Amino acid sequence: RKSRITNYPKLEDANKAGTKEGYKCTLVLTEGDSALSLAVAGLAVVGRDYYGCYPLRGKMLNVREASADQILKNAEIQAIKKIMGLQHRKKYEDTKSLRYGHLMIMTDQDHDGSHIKGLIINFLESSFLGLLDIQGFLLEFITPIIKVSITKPTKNTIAFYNMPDYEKWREEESHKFTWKQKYYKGLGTSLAQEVREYFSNLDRHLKIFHSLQGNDKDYIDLAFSKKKADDRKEWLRQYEPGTVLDPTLKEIPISDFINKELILFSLADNIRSIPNVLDGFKPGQRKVLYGCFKKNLKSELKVAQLAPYVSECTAYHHGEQSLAQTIIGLAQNFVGSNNIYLLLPNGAFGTRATGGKDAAAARYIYTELNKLTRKIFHPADDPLYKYIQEDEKTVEPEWYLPILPMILVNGAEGIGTGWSTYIPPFNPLEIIKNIRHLMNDEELEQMHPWFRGWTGTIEEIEPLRYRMYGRIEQIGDNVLEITELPARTWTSTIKEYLLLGLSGNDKIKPWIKDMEEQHDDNIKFIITLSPEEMAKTRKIGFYERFKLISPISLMNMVAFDPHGKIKKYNSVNEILSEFYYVRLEYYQKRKDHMSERLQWEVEKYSFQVKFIKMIIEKELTVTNKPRNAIIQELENLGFPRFNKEGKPYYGSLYGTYEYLLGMRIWSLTKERYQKLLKQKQEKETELENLLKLSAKDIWNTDLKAFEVGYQEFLQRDAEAR
Amino acid sequence: RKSRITNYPKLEDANKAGTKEGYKCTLVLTEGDSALSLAVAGLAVVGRDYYGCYPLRGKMLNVREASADQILKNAEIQAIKKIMGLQHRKKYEDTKSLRYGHLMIMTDQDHDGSHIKGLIINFLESSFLGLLDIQGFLLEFITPIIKVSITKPTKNTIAFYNMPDYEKWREEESHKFTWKQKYYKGLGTSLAQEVREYFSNLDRHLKIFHSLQGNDKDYIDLAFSKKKADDRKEWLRQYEPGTVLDPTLKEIPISDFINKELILFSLADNIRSIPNVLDGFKPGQRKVLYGCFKKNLKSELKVAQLAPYVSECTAYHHGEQSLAQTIIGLAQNFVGSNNIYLLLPNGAFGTRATGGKDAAAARYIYTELNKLTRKIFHPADDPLYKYIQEDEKTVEPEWYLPILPMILVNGAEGIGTGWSTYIPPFNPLEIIKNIRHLMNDEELEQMHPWFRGWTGTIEEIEPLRYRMYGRIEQIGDNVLEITELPARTWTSTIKEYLLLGLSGNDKIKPWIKDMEEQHDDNIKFIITLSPEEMAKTRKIGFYERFKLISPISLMNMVAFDPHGKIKKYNSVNEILSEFYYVRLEYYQKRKDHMSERLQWEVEKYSFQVKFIKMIIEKELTVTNKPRNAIIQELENLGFPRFNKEGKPYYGSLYGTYEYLLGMRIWSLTKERYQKLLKQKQEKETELENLLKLSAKDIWNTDLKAFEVGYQEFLQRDAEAR
DNA sequence: CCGAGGATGACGATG
DNA sequence: CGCGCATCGTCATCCTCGG
């Protein structure tokens, strides 16, 4: 007397499941088929009797709220339904009815892991009422995030299940030994030997979800309910940094699973989904750019080689395939893509006809920096940024600070949790114009969306709302010619449509008599209509019936502000301004950075001169004096030391006297002493000039050089189609 | 009056196709959707009127010989059928009936490209009789393989459509300028600008296939016919190196498309598919190993980081994903995989239950060299190999030469063209035993297949034929317990089967009453049978009915011999012997390599001694003598120079006197002169000892150290399950 | 054939 | 060589009902 489930091959079934003992049987759900091996490995240790396992594809269907048809057709929740047993329609009191009495989740201990757990809680708490009220039914197997490897001259080997947990052993006892750490960024970086250990224990890897208590049910809704995106916006506002969940508790009330472990993924989801108002980047794109700057992309290389590089040296945690698509995206140049593309698309990078999905394999295509790109991201600014620490490596900045708001240039789209974003691209020219307006305490011009190489029309209806038109023309007796589709309308979308109008449908009658394509480095649909259907078309409208009108809305322009707080901007200029005031402050910062360096060189020179001077008139001798007795005698005479980066140090990482010792015996001449005095008083004049230029003055010098560069950028763009 | 094709969205259709003008219309077929962009780009230049394009997925269905059902269900040849028009059943005389009058192939100009062309010729010449008799119907668009970029101080930019074509400009005029080359290893590394050029020309990119002439029809069959694998074996034997096709011909008789362009892929297909008898590797695996040796894999790194490295520095032309799966394969250790795994599987590398397909993502898993691996591939042998030149870089060797035939250890499988291969794994122990037999002019023992960690039985029936058994046991009243499946029989194969026997089928009645799994670090199916069905089972046999008998055949053990010629070996010892005689010759080579180096050092020392001696008794002075007048005075006195690698040169890349100048003034002492004389006469004794050891003596020393290492290898394997 | 109003899909970084 | 689905938010267009 046992129910055997037979349409699910991947299920390793508990020997006792579906029998009068199913209530003692736990079901282990893993994140994906790869992790399914770890569970099965575990089933060896704990026993195939009261344990079984099944693989969760990946992100699973949020069932609240969702149509019957939707969930019925969803074969994964159907799988967990049939194997657990679970009748859909009634209230739960026992688990005595199901094939398994307990369900346990093996996520791989990252953020998206927690997103999976939550999705499961939602599913269970929605599809079956009384279920999560049954104490001890939902379990969670947890795994280490870091393993430390103690090496000299000893080796106990340890494990850590949180970051702060670990960071603490670090500025605590890390010093006490020799050691090296290892990140467990997903299941299956765990060795077999190790997984067996876990399972041999599992009183310390199992944590239980407490049954539903007051406000549990609410939070699950105030997180997964499709009706509550606005509240999620505040729920995230409210989260107070550092609020994580206890390392050893064994009971985890939902209500701060949600409020202490889901918000962590939710905060993460937004960070990778939404751009910073300052540079227009998302963390992934910002890594790619940094990587290019790190090496010297003045000469091209396959994006397949540039992938592993950016990846390796920015602590990337996703595919190289994932990384490469990001590079490809930065480089695409067809009409409707990048108003300015920072990377050059040398090869098959995708085309307008499909919105760039047609692109070739990373290993056959090449990029380099766009010559103009280093005119937008000025190198002189690089020394100023805060370079993030990640996985104990330093990497790209929080943000870059281009000389114009790139987010306004290129725009951005994104879908996060609670928040969403859309900003259309604008015109680098008008943008610069408003920057000038802000520099002169003047009233700003208004700006409209604008697409590089596009040739249609964009009109404002209400503020924050626009309509974008293509071009349709009559070119003969009942003959029309389309020469422009709205931007981001791909050719093949319009093609499927015309072809349908042509042959007709088993839902619609054909209305196009004949069509032909003649696209050139441009769009060209030539369409013929029966005099009957030409009549119909005027009534319904030519642009309307031919799918050549699309809207552009600025009612959801959101971005992380400079303090890293998500913000909804209510106008285009509200963005431009925020940029301006931060971009202006950093011009001071740069001027000041550059003058501190010149200051250090005048300093350098002054002491070289005094140095020569001393020897010349013979107050200091060098020939035949030991390393120590000579440089310890320089210390006496006040002479500073000098490091690799030019900075002085004046008393007892600090730098050496190699700026004075490195000088030879060609050194001790009137001719050198003069040559020195000369460059010194020129590094003085140099400094005087710099200090005259204000922040707007410097900014402007960059804007001008950009203006030139942007014209050459344009001429190359046009010359390439 | 035009036929419009409407179930194929990807087709950019020639405006005039399907009309009374279809016969003037060419159809452009591309290798894959990515290349489809290039054709469409071309349709802009040549015109949408008489041209169209459709994408070939990849390798297409060879139709000869193939069942109606097979081809009918093949939606790609269905696509080309419907769009060309092509009625299946009758004889062709005109093209006046079809929608296109000419068909043209855009392959990406590599070997597999030509495999596509051939496949198309086969298809056309088989499915439609008179077609390829119509002169000028089959075209071929060709693309450059290399582009040279002339830089200083001038720039005409050139293109090359063959290798030899180019190699010739090289040892010709490459010297004449500054330049850099670029490989076009597939379509879509071509820039847009460039593709437009091609199409603006295309009298010089189009080549025509001459209609079918005598022996054309035969060759197509004597290549693609499933009945002629043996002839293909000879057809490849016959091919005479250097026999390629003319660069400018414009007409390409099939008969040496096949015999001058297909055999090139066929030769290539075999090289990547079949291993070398010497190291057991295929070129891809051999690259991976070299890469590890190149860096120092004594400490682990994610295979995702090791991928781009091996790749980058061995001129790999496939995915990093492709590369990574190869690394994963070298590391897998479950029972039924690698008798010795050269790389360690640290993480989720795949498991027996699925034959390793369950493995995790490259970025979550780690490898390093197996400690034993450098005991099989001795580093001292590295200096001896011929390191292939590829794409003007040097890279891995033709083959490695392990101290035992690794191909016999690990075995190999492969499917090429004409040829195929299967060699089961054998026992490193028995192997060494036969090596000893060959070293002593003794009669060899016979060997049987053998799987690390496997616990079943392998019996010989005929020579070259074996049967492999699992273990089935009766463990109670009508209760059976399976504890071993034949090797390379995966758990889940046996599971699907038992589950079917359990629930039964709509083709078969259930015969298993109950089954349970209890696998531990081992297999354990516990099966219950009705007394009725236990009776039936004895009659049909327990091993037979429970799928626990599988064959092992040695009737197709093929490998590239040492001279790179494919060979079918007729016994296991025929392989072992070939290895032995080459492995023995290279022991001499090594001994000789090592003694030449010692010889050079005795030499070094001798001249240092003479050097000091000269100064000591003062026949040569140094203090205050110019670089030139001092080292030009050493040249006079006979003293040799010395390079980076230790080799002397004695007269007027050659090396410097830094082995004598680098010596200081602590140098000129009795104490140094003694110390020198001492190490010299010890580098002398050192040489004397080495020269005593024969090749078998050295080989044996390695075998012994291996024997120890292999025991530790085993103990770690067992301790990890 | 109408408008209403509910359901559905496209974007892009993730499993 | 190709294809799929899932989250997540917004807004647009498709699709179904009922007059």
Added chain:
DNA sequence: CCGAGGATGACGATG
């Protein structure tokens, strides 16, 4: 349910 004999699939590096 028999054996015959034709069709089908598994392996692994490629499109």
Added chain:
DNA sequence: CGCGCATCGTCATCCTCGG
């Protein structure tokens, strides 16, 4: 996060027919 198909050679087992 999942799935598919194609070449290519050999040999094994599945599957269909017809007695």
